[PDB]
Enzyme design. Structure first.
Site, short mmCIF file in Angstrom:
data_model
loop_
_atom_site.label_atom_id
_atom_site.label_comp_id
_atom_site.label_asym_id
_atom_site.label_seq_id
_atom_site.Cartn_x
_atom_site.Cartn_y
_atom_site.Cartn_z
N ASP A 51 0.83 -1.20 0.00
CA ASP A 51 0.00 0.00 0.00
C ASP A 51 0.88 1.27 0.00
O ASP A 51 0.67 2.19 0.79
CB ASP A 51 -1.08 -0.02 1.11
CG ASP A 51 -2.22 0.99 0.91
OD1 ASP A 51 -2.13 1.83 -0.01
OD2 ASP A 51 -3.20 0.92 1.66
N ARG A 60 0.01 9.01 1.34
CA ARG A 60 -0.78 8.95 2.58
C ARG A 60 -0.12 7.95 3.56
O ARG A 60 -0.32 8.08 4.77
CB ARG A 60 -2.27 8.59 2.33
CG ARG A 60 -2.48 7.15 1.89
CD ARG A 60 -3.91 6.74 1.52
NE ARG A 60 -3.81 5.46 0.83
CZ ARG A 60 -3.59 5.32 -0.47
NH1 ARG A 60 -3.60 6.39 -1.27
NH2 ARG A 60 -3.40 4.12 -0.99
N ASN A 61 0.70 6.98 3.05
CA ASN A 61 1.40 6.01 3.91
C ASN A 61 2.90 6.33 4.08
O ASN A 61 3.69 5.45 4.43
CB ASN A 61 1.17 4.57 3.45
CG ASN A 61 -0.28 4.18 3.59
OD1 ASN A 61 -0.95 4.57 4.55
ND2 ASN A 61 -0.83 3.50 2.62
N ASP A 83 3.82 1.84 7.68
CA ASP A 83 2.75 0.84 7.61
C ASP A 83 2.94 -0.18 6.50
O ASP A 83 1.98 -0.78 6.00
CB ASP A 83 1.37 1.56 7.55
CG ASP A 83 1.09 2.34 8.83
OD1 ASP A 83 1.69 2.02 9.89
OD2 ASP A 83 0.29 3.30 8.77
C1 LIG Z 1 -1.13 15.87 12.44
N1 LIG Z 1 0.04 15.02 12.69
C2 LIG Z 1 0.07 13.67 12.65
C3 LIG Z 1 1.35 13.30 12.95
C4 LIG Z 1 1.86 11.94 13.02
N2 LIG Z 1 3.12 11.63 13.41
C5 LIG Z 1 3.23 10.26 13.33
N3 LIG Z 1 4.24 9.45 13.55
C6 LIG Z 1 4.11 8.14 13.42
C7 LIG Z 1 2.92 7.53 13.02
C8 LIG Z 1 1.81 8.36 12.74
C9 LIG Z 1 0.58 7.75 12.19
C10 LIG Z 1 0.65 6.61 11.34
C11 LIG Z 1 -0.50 6.07 10.77
C12 LIG Z 1 -1.75 6.66 11.02
C13 LIG Z 1 -3.06 6.13 10.45
N4 LIG Z 1 -2.93 4.88 9.67
C14 LIG Z 1 -2.76 3.67 10.23
O1 LIG Z 1 -2.68 3.54 11.44
C15 LIG Z 1 -2.58 2.48 9.35
N5 LIG Z 1 -2.94 2.37 8.08
C16 LIG Z 1 -2.51 1.15 7.65
C17 LIG Z 1 -2.74 0.52 6.28
C18 LIG Z 1 -2.09 1.38 5.18
C19 LIG Z 1 -2.15 -0.89 6.18
C20 LIG Z 1 -4.24 0.42 5.98
N6 LIG Z 1 -1.83 0.64 8.66
O2 LIG Z 1 -1.84 1.39 9.64
C21 LIG Z 1 -1.80 7.82 11.80
F1 LIG Z 1 -2.97 8.43 12.03
C22 LIG Z 1 -0.66 8.36 12.39
C23 LIG Z 1 1.98 9.77 12.89
N7 LIG Z 1 1.18 10.85 12.75
C24 LIG Z 1 2.12 14.47 13.16
N8 LIG Z 1 1.32 15.48 12.99
#
Ligand SMILES: Cn1cc(-c2nc3nccc(-c4ccc(CNC(=O)c5nc(C(C)(C)C)no5)c(F)c4)c3[nH]2)cn1
Length: 267
Positions: free
Chosen positions: A130, A134-135, A148
């Site tokens: 994926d 966005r990832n 991810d």
């Molecule tokens: C405004 N803002 C935000 C930050 C932020 N810093 C971060 N550091 C590390 C990690 C994150 C972080 C990482 C992921 C997600 C949401 N997705 C998932 O969890 C997820 N999707 C999937 C698949 C593709 C397989 C479907 N797998 O997992 C998330 F919401 C935050 C971070 N965010 C700094 N500022």
């Protein structure tokens, strides 16, 4: 208890970061000093026992451009996934903030960071599945890192797993994925080319005027995304090479890395 196991009592929760496929992700401290991101896995969203077994392998995937898996909190529910924290968030949101006024050299460095992570994954025969802006995540230094990777395999939501599903990454998929569910290192290559297009388009949606169905038809007829205005002809040549109709004719991440480095030297 186990090498992969983190004590949730060692966590201090400080802020909500966002919500994704598995629910909320928060920013925290581990043992008071170490920055972490904490995925609080929502019930019924994940194949937990399968992920747990894979976390052991995923923890051994270490590269400067890969968002590191630190461990898991499994002696409970919701289970937690503990990762490396990235101060600047989501690469897609970062690209869309016009205030950065990115120079093309910065856009190429983002492609390079991703390519280095992808060449590492390719060398371990590990598929992202994926790959998209966005990832990807951005740290406080503006360094882009792949997040991810391989987690798609544990998503229980049929809207995400079905190639005809509403949440499936249609616009980042090659024809053989959409037609026959043929996943390989070459489907990650295809997605990387699309990610390069997202970077040079400053986060525009690939095939912005098409639906997922129309994109699948477009791509199956041999048609492609065209040149972002900020991409030079050499940069566009690299992303285009990822979209060869024949999967075996697509480059490897090692070849793409050499192509990106050559363009960095040229511009
Ligand atoms: C405004 N803002 C935000 C930050 C932020 N810093 C971060 N550091 C590390 C990690 C994150 C972080 C990482 C992921 C997600 C949401 N997705 C998932 O969890 C997820 N999707 C999937 C698949 C593709 C397989 C479907 N797998 O997992 C998330 F919401 C935050 C971070 N965010 C700094 N500022």
């Amino acid at each position: 208890y186990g090498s992969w196991e983190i004590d949730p009592k060692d966590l201090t929760f400080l802020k909500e970061l966002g919500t994704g496929q598995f629910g909320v992700v928060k920013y925290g401290k581990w043992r008071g000093q170490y920055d972490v991101a904490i995925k609080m896995i929502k019930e019924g969203s994940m194949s937990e026992d399968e992920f747990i077994e894979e976390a052991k392998v995923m923890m051994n995937l270490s590269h400067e451009k890969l968002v590191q898996l630190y461990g898991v909190c499994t002696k409970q529910r919701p289970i937690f996934i503990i990762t490396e924290y990235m101060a600047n968030g989501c690469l897609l949101n970062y690209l869309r903030e016009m205030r950065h006024r990115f120079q093309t050299q910065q856009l190429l460095e983002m492609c390079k960071d991703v390519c280095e992570a992808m060449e590492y994954l390719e060398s371990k025969q590990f598929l992202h599945r994926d790959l998209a802006a966005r990832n990807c995540l951005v740290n406080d230094q503006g360094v882009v890192k792949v997040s991810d990777f391989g987690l798609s395999r544990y998503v229980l939501d049929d809207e995400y797993t079905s190639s005809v599903g509403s949440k499936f990454p249609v616009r980042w998929s090659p024809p053989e994925v959409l037609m026959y569910s043929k996943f390989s290192s070459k489907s990650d290559i295809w997605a990387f080319g699309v990610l390069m297009w997202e970077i040079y388009s400053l986060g525009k949606m690939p095939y912005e005027r098409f639906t997922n169905s129309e994109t699948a038809e477009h791509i199956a007829q041999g048609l492609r995304l065209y040149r972002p205005h900020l991409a030079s002809e050499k940069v566009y040549t690299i992303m285009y090479s990822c979209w060869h109709e024949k999967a075996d004719e697509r480059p490897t991440f090692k070849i793409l890395l050499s192509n990106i480095l050559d363009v960095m030297d040229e511009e």
